[PDB]
């Protein structure tokens, strides 16, 4: 609802196409921070809603090291960037499980401690 | 120190390269472009014409913006024609 507020102003002025859009600030970014998730949505189900706008190559769900349950945020890289422009913009503020999730562009830095979780995820997304 | 700097640079590069979208990197332009699995049934229309991933459930999920961009897209494209045609004297 922070970002959703921008695009309405932006569009209203007829900004139209990325050169003048704030989405142009990125261009080298693909991963999207996916916030305010419900707790029971897992990687496969976050890999349901987000293929509407593109083809995901990677995904990471943030979850506590001990109990292994959702922190409530994920990082999902689309194959073709412009999906990011599309997902952030179009799907932000949308309800799943009662709570309206947040998306925004992100620069994502991998962490050693999950290293195996990368191949374990990749191998499934490497199937396609 | 120099070696350290070099290492840092390398890591930065790695970070950036990992982050970059795949189609741009091969790029040079603009059933998958990179052979990734693609959907089957007809999808909703889109600004960029991108096709949903094979794994899509098939429900509309949208705030409703993507359709409102077309309304503005059509508008702006229409008033370029209306401006001359409604001109009079």
């Amino acid at each position: 609802n922070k970002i959703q507020q921008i695009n309405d102003k932006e569009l209203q002025s007829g900004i139209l196409s990325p050169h003048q859009s704030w989405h142009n600030e990125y261009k080298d970014n693909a991963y999207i921070y996916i916030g305010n998730l419900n707790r029971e949505l897992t990687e496969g189900d976050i890999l349901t809603v987000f293929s509407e706008y593109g083809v995901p190559v990677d995904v990471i769900l943030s979850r506590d090291e001990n109990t292994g349950e959702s922190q409530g945020f994920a990082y999902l890289k689309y194959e073709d960037q412009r999906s990011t422009i599309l997902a952030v913009d179009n799907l932000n503020g949308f309800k799943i499980g009662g709570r309206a999730l947040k998306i925004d562009h992100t620069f994502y830095r991998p962490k050693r401690s999950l290293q195996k979780y990368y191949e374990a995820v990749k191998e499934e997304l490497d199937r396609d | 120190s120099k070696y350290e700097d070099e290492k840092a640079a390398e890591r930065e590069q790695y970070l950036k390269n990992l982050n970059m979208g795949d189609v741009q990197k091969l790029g040079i332009n603009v059933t998958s472009l990179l052979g990734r699995k693609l959907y089957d049934k007809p999808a909703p229309e889109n600004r960029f014409a991108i096709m949903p991933g094979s794994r899509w459930d098939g429900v509309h999920r949208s705030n409703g913006f993507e359709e409102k961009w077309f309304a503005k897209q059509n508008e702006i494209n229409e008033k370029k024609v209306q401006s001359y045609t409604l001109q009079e004297d």
Binding site: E40, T42, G44, D45, V49, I96, G97, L114, Y117 | -
Partner: peptide, 22 residues
């Protein structure tokens, strides 16, 4: 050698996504 990592992904449907449609 016991487990790769204690965490690991799922790739399993939750009842929430299917439920909302029906």
């Amino acid at each position: 050698k016991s487990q790769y990592i204690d965490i690991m992904p799922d790739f399993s449907p939750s009842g929430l996504l299917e439920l909302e449609s029906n």
